[PDB]
Amino acid sequence: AVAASSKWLEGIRKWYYNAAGFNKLGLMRDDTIYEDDDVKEAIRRLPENLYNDRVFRIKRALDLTMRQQILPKEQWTKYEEDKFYLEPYLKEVIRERKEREEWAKK
């Protein structure tokens, strides 16, 4: 939460984004999350058009990896255009699980 050196830390976040390479397969950040029972409930709560966009991006990246190839550089996901589409649905599923758990001990 520093205010003067949050330009330094904005550059480290960009460096780590490029060094990880899901953008070279045309993926977004929320495509790569590990699917536990919590994440599987947020997936089935998505609207139809966002669910269909996610199934095609994953299928295309799984096909590039079978061939040991990547996309042309003009089609790499940019750092400022990655949409965190799954994050508001996941925070609500987790908040409901904490409430069933505080109820069971009290």
Binding site: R45, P47, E96, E99, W103
Partner: protein, 418 residues
């Protein structure tokens, strides 16, 4: 004692409370909503709104509502008719201020999330099939569709093509336009009067005014037949009568008890029912007859209801209809009008006896008339009905245009023109 405190807020809300000293409390919210306020693009929205009382709201999740009410042993229920919706909460006297906050969240701040509304659509099919195991449920929905062109032809249950397609935006639009403060009555039975008022300025912040302007109901004289495999024939035959809260409506109530409106003795032969004795002169099979009455804010229906075997259905309907003609040309004894007034008075005092019947009686008075009347004022209105007013109500039935609905094996049932 303390008969009732009655207050109108400056934007329409009606508040009424009675302080008993009973161990249990009951609180109800009564709204002018219901199936008469939907048009042909959103049929069945009121049925799904009735089933959605324990979904997530802005102040409590769906887990907290079910767990919080069950922790103190309370109840929550919704009752609807064609013109009204009623939300009721009851528990023990020490817990009632916990359940009041839940009731104001269900009615004044609902959310309608997509994934919860989509899982509820299959409940519409279960609730309708349970209700239609009684043969009178489907006959009485077909009778309202035969009698009206609109406003009062919409069913209480969602149509079959429409199950699966009630959207969250249709639910948001219905509540925003019909659940407003000038259409609402808050009625308490074991609470105090200043505590309900402070509850009322918690949803006086929004939803002010009258809503929208439903249309007048237009009478249609129609017929709906339904051939099926049921073992008995149900049939109903009505005409247009009189609106709630007029001097002719009291005369139709007296005429219902002259003809007969249900038995008083277990397994008794109905010795003082006029309709039952006339049918039993020539029909020696099992049957049942009754007079039917239904009063609304701008119209009413009155007629007869028969249940018979299929080969006897025309004999029963003609014998019953011939008895109403005898009354309409003057044959009406004075000791019969007096015994009908006794059954009407005693039935009214027995129906306000329990806490559920009393709360319903006060809540329907506040929506239609905006006041409360004691049962001694009601009992005077019944005694001021004259014998000529009863004969005049039986002439309005006989000369009026008829509607009909029937179901069963209809191969011996008459058509409405025969």
């Amino acid at each position: 004692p303390q008969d009732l405190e009655f207050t109108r807020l400056p934007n329409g809300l009606v508040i009424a409370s009675l302080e008993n000293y009973a161990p249990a409390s009951r609180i109800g919210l009564f709204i002018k909503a219901g199936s008469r306020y939907e048009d042909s693009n959103n049929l069945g929205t009121s049925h799904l709104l009735r089933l959605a009382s324990s979904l997530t709201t802005k102040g409590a999740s769906s887990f907290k509502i079910t767990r919080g009410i069950e922790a103190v042993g309370g109840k929550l229920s919704v009752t609807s008719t064609r013109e009204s919706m009623a939300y009721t909460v009851e528990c023990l006297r020490d817990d009632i201020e916990i359940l009041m906050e839940f009731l104001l969240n269900v009615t004044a701040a609902p959310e309608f999330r997509r994934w919860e509304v989509a899982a509820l659509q299959s409940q519409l099919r279960i609730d309708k099939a349970v209700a239609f195991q009684n043969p009178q449920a489907q006959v009485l929905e077909n009778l309202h569709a035969a009698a009206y062109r609109n406003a009062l032809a919409n069913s209480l249950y969602c149509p079959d093509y429409r199950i699966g397609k009630v959207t969250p935006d249709q639910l948001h639009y219905y509540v925003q336009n019909h659940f407003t403060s000038a259409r609402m009555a808050l009625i308490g039975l074991g609470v105090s009067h200043p505590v309900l008022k402070q509850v009322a300025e918690r949803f006086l912040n929004m939803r002010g005014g009258l809503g929208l302007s439903g249309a007048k109901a237009k009478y249609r004289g129609g017929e709906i037949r339904d051939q099926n495999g049921d073992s008995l024939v149900h049939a109903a035959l009505v005409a247009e009568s009189a609106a709630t809260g007029s001097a002719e409506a009291n005369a139709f109530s007296v005429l219902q008890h002259v003809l007969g409106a249900g038995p008083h003795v277990k397994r008794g032969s109905n010795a003082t029912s006029s309709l039952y004795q006339a049918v039993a002169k020539g029909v020696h099979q099992p049957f049942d007859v009754s007079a039917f009455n239904a009063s609304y804010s701008d119209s009413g229906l009155f007629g007869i209801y028969t249940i018979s075997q299929a080969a006897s259905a025309g004999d029963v309907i003609k014998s019953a209809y011939d008895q109403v003609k005898a009354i309409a040309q003057g044959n009406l004894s004075n000791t019969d009008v007096q015994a009908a007034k006794n059954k009407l008075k005693a039935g009214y005092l027995m129906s306000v006896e329990s806490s559920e019947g009393f709360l319903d009686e006060v809540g329907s008075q506040a929506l239609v008339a905006g006041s409360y009347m004691q049962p001694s004022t009601v009992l005077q209105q019944i005694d001021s009905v004259a014998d000529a007013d009863v004969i005049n109500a039986a002439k309005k039935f006989v000369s009026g245009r008829k509607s009909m609905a029937a179901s069963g094996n209809l191969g011996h049932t008459p058509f409405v023109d025969e």
